[PDB]
């Protein structure tokens, strides 16, 4: 159980009873002369929450003061020319503007308290200069109705050393430029070596102004340093100097052969001033003015008049996710900008990424249907882009090199459970004294679930459906290793398989196969799956032989397999015949691969599909195995057996054998309606070895998941049922030399194709493996609206009569929802810390917390997060795409994996209680997610003790065909 393990959340304070005042200054189109900063340093020494920033109007800056209870002294901390324009309390409602302005204000005091306690700051990191010496990163968000919390990201870094007189001496004797860390923001520059003394009058006025904002110690005082080609005088106290699995591959490799105050002032306004709520990370296009730019981003990103953007959209934070994650290429260029920089670099990367038959691509999606199978970041440049504006302003004060190496590479270069929580206990009195001038320590997940005001139990394990006797059987998933022991019977009623084996003329390689497939005959038949007998004609026990050399392998593949696939009864006297009374076996060809592009073996299947009669070719499956399985090694035999039994896909019978012998009747009526040309052919009904057990009108819910390929050429989708009784997928191509509306349109008639082959009303839930961009949702909302689903309801009543009478037989859609799926990467929990069975070594568990995530506490598309919930799981995940984890790749390798799911449409009651029909935004999360947990439990390989990965099967099978199209094309 993970209810009692520690995660990294510290409850800071409460927003209840808070009071704030906003002050305004208008200036022309000097630090003590500046009324904004003189009041800012004065209140910072007063230990009250303060934050300053600019506005859309030039020469216009503001101050914010936050406090609880008794007001501070306002007759001295505020300049004479300063005036107020806002006086707000907690009970009057908080905007999103005032919500994140606390987060910078609490960080203003928290940075100052950290500098007093022998910690130094490099950008977004705080580390102790010279394991118990680690760098920590702070971000702030509001969880619950009024509660404020923070999360600490702790990463291992190389040790850093403070600058002293010793390093200056070797710097002057060094002919090469000497590389040091500059500023609280981690700038990279060259130390020339001109040290300064505290008795100098030049540094005397310098250290007096520096102490007003930054708490500096109190002899060496300053040093001349050159950064980005510009020399600048800086205090030496803030200058820093840095220090400057295997066995398995070998085994098989064996087996191959023998077988500067003004500079930091401007940099504080745009680099550390962007601390937003992490619950808004799944954000989208603005609802207030319907733009990809809004709020106060227009002074941070380089007009149009956005008027009071009250939603939580921030285009700065949004851009980071947009640059390298799975997104539409039209939408990707909107977030970057075709006119501005790096839009040409993304176009070049896509075009270099690209630089065949239609039926062969269809073959690729059949084999992966079953259960069992560089680029620089944008805000790395944006900080370097803000380096140019800050350095130009500071050089004006005194009267490609900047964008290249402005910031130090110490932050971008790179554990245990006990040492991290030791630092978490160490940080606890620091944050407690920061607010008191209480704080909960390391929260458990039970504490996190309690504090939200909403079950803290782990989510229950759903059962399956099997059969021990001829009847059905509800079973736990833990009896899956005991399939042949309990001799259970699956769905599908024991389909029999006849097989052909393709093998070269190597004698040592020949004998390993005939031992393998006879044992494969045993494991398929010891388990209750039918008969694994070969082709009934005797050809060296069902194995045929053949004979760069692939052309020789292909001629006899084509010239032989074509036409091949195209009265005494002693013991029958004691028993009588039963009578005339009332299914062909599956044909799956087995192919061995001597190669260690291998599409040439698959080119046989393109030749066998065409040169056969339709009755033979309607059910033909292809099986590929490597040749190294025969020679060098259990769990392999049963896994290959259940995959082929899944891929049989038994077709619906076309002949019904009524033998009515009458000119007309009801027996001929269903016979005639079955052979009508508007019925499709080759239904290929799907029955897995196990389906989801039912949970106590008649309805059905579909789960569909889609994501793009490595290029933007292909959109790949897969769909499942509520109980997982159906498993279908599709490939849709969009290639251009408008362009994105047609691809999203083409997916939906395929989605409408599956529901209209049923005849009960449906409920639709769309999953996206990637992140929903700004332009996808415009198509997803417009054509899948309330009116249009009512429009197709009137249309479907036309061609089908009984859809007109009974609505329960019409396969319409009752409600529509969209869920985006993306990682969080902010919080971490360790299972080793406690407060009869320990969880992660032997089993998996899943815990959920959800919330409505209202924009403030106080047309067709509402707010960008309708509701959000976290998906943490002890179960590990499989191979994810690269663009999935380009957001925060440091959270990939932790075993309890954090996921972030949001809501985007939530269209209830189209035909006008079900959990999806409720207008409460929290309930529609907590319906689909435990079924998402349920379909994740259908991914259990019976050769594996647990499920082979996390995530639902429609996401996994989509990744099973994404990795196949990665490797093979």
């Amino acid at each position: 159980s993970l209810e009692d393990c520690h995660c990294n959340l510290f409850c800071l304070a409460d927003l209840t009873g808070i009071k704030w005042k906003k002050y305004v200054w208008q200036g022309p189109t000097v630090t003590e002369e500046d009324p904004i900063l003189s009041s800012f340093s004065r209140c910072l020494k007063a230990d009250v929450l303060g934050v300053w920033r600019r506005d859309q109007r030039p020469g216009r800056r503001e101050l914010w003061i936050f406090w609880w209870g008794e007001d501070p002294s306002f007759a001295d901390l505020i300049h004479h020319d300063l005036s107020e324009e806002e006086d707000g309390v907690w009970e009057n409602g908080l905007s999103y503007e005032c919500r994140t302005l606390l987060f910078k204000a609490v960080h203003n005091l928290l940075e100052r308290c950290l500098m007093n306690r022998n910690f130094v700051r490099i950008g977004k990191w705080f580390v102790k200069p010279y394991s118990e010496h680690l760098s920590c990163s702070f971000t702030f968000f509001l969880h619950g109705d009024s509660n404020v919390c923070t999360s600490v990201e702790i990463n291992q870094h190389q040790p850093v050393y403070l600058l002293s007189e010793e390093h200056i001496t070797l710097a002057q004797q060094s002919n090469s430029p000497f590389q040091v860390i500059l500023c609280p923001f981690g700038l990279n520059g060259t130390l020339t070596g001109q040290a300064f003394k505290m008795s100098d009058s030049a540094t005397k006025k310098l250290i007096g102004e520096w102490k007003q904002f930054y708490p500096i110690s109190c002899s060496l005082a300053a040093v001349e340093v050159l950064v980005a080609g510009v020399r600048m005088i800086y205090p030496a106290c803030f200058v820093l100097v840095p220090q400057s699995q295997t066995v398995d591959p070998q085994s098989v490799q064996k087996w191959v052969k023998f077988s500067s105050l003004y500079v930091n002032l401007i940099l504080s306004e745009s680099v550390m001033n962007l601390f937003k709520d992490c619950n808004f990370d799944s954000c989208c296009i603005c609802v207030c003015n319907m733009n990809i730019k809004g709020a106060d981003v227009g002074v941070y990103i380089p007009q149009e008049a956005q008027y009071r953007c009250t939603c939580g959209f921030s285009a700065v934070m949004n851009r980071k996710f947009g640059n390298n994650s799975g997104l539409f290429l039209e939408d990707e260029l909107d977030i970057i900008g075709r006119n501005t920089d790096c839009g040409k670099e993304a176009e070049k990367r896509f075009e270099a990424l690209r630089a065949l038959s239609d039926d062969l691509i269809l073959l690729l999606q059949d084999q992966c249907t079953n259960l069992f199978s560089n680029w620089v970041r944008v805000e790395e440049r944006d900080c370097c882009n803000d380096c140019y504006l800050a350095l130009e302003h500071g050089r004006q004060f005194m009267d490609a090199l900047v964008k290249s190496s402005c910031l130090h590479p110490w932050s971008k270069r790179n554990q245990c459970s006990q040492d991290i929580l030791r630092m978490l206990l160490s940080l606890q009195p620091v944050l407690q004294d920061a607010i008191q001038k209480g704080v909960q320590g390391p929260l458990t997940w039970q504490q996190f679930h309690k504090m939200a005001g909403r079950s803290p139990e782990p989510l229950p394990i759903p059962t399956f459906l099997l059969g021990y006797d001829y009847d059905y059987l509800v079973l736990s998933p833990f009896a899956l290793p005991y399939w042949e022991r309990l001799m259970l019977e699956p769905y599908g009623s024991q389909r029999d398989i006849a097989y052909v084996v393709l093998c070269p003329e190597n004698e040592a390689l020949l004998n390993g196969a005939k031992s393998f497939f006879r044992d494969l005959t045993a494991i398929y038949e010891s388990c209750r799956l039918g008969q694994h007998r070969p082709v009934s004609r005797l050809l060296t026990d069902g194995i045929m032989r053949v004979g760069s050399k692939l052309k020789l392998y292909a001629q006899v593949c084509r010239y032989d397999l074509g036409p091949y696939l195209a009265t005494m009864d002693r013991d029958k006297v004691g028993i009588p015949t039963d009578g005339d009374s009332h299914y062909p076996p599956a044909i799956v060809v087995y192919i061995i691969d001597p190669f260690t592009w291998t599409l040439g073996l698959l080119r046989c299947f393109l030749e066998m599909v065409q040169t056969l009669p339709p009755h033979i070719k309607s059910t033909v499956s292809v099986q590929i195995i490597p040749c190294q399985y025969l020679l060098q090694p259990p769990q392999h035999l049963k896994s290959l057996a259940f995959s082929a039994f899944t891929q049989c896909r038994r077709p619906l019978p076309t002949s019904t054998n009524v033998k009515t012998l009458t000119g007309f009747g009801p027996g001929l009526a269903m016979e005639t309606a079955l052979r009508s040309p508007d019925r499709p052919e080759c239904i290929r009904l799907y029955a897995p070895p196990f389906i989801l057990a039912p949970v106590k009108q008649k309805y059905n819910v579909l789960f569909v998941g889609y994501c793009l390929s490595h290029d933007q050429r292909w959109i790949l989708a897969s769909c499942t049922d509520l109980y997982g009784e159906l498993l279908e997928t599709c490939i849709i191509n969009i290639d251009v030399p408008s362009a994105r509306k047609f691809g999203l349109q083409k997916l939906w008639e395929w989605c409408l194709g599956l529901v209209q082959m049923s005849s009960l009303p449906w409920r639709v839930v769309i999953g996206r493996l990637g992140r929903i961009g700004h332009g996808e949702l415009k198509d997803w909302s417009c054509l899948l609206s309330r009116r249009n689903l009512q429009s197709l309801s009137k249309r479907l009543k036309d061609m089908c009569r009984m859809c007109g009478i009974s609505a329960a037989d019409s396969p319409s859609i009752l409600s529509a929802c969209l869920v985006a799926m993306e990682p969080q990467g902010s919080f971490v929990i360790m299972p080793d810390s406690v407060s009869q069975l320990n969880t992660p070594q032997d089993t998996s568990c899943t815990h959920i917390l959800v919330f409505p995530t209202s924009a403030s506490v106080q047309p067709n598309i509402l707010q960008q997060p309708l509701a959000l919930g976290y998906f943490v799981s002890t179960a590990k995940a499989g191979p994810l795409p690269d663009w999935f984890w380009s957001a925060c790749p440091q959270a990939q390798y932790q075993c309890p994996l954090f996921l972030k799911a949001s809501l985007h449409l939530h269209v209830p009651s189209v035909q006008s209680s079900h959990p999806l029909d409720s207008n409460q935004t929290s309930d529609v999360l907590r319906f689909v997610l435990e079924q998402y947990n349920a379909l994740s439990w259908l991914t259990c390989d019976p050769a594996t003790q647990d499920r082979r990965s996390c995530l639902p099967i429609h996401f996994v099978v989509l990744n099973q065909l994404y990795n196949f199209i990665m490797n093979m094309l």
Binding site: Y468, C730, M802
Partner: protein, 165 residues
């Protein structure tokens, strides 16, 4: 530095080897020293422990005698398990006992799991919460028979999607 000295006196006795084998196990298993504090300490503290138990051989009977006294109490765990003998292994089953949570784990020898006897003799059906439910037709199968009277719109021939725009 002390116990490296009279280590040659330790192997003179037999039971005093085991009396000094157990006291240092409490130190290593309690996490008083870890890898990040001193890598070289774990290199040292197992080196005489390698030949502490080799001194039992140079009898085999005494070797299993103190071995059964050391797995009984229990990356750091990987190193201490390298010196001790290869243990016998028993098959594990995870028991739910229900909503439906997980409760316990039972260990069973693999010599009992055979298909000769018709019911589950070493396995309890109440471990799994097994429910016998009656036979019903497939829900997809009855949808095909129910589809025969509607004659809805034509589905795509699955190659229409793989076309240029």
């Amino acid at each position: 530095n002390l116990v490296g000295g009279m280590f040659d006196t330790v192997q003179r006795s037999t039971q005093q080897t085991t009396e000094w084998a157990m006291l240092l196990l409490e130190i290593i298993i309690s996490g008083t020293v870890d890898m990040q504090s001193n890598n070289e300490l774990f290199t040292t503290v197992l080196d005489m422990l390698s030949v502490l138990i080799n001194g039992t051989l140079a009898n085999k009977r005494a070797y299993m005698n103190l071995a059964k006294k050391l797995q009984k109490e229990l990356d750091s765990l990987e190193k201490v398990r390298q010196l001790l003998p290869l243990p016998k292994q028993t098959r594990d089953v995870i028991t739910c006992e229900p909503g439906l949570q997980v409760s316990t784990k039972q260990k069973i020898s693999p010599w009992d799991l055979f298909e000769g006897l018709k019911p589950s003799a070493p396995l309890s059906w109440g471990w799994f919460g097994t429910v016998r439910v009656d036979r019903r037709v497939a829900r997809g199968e009855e949808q095909q028979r129910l589809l025969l009277y509607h004659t809805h719109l034509r589905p795509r021939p699955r190659a229409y999607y793989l076309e240029p725009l």
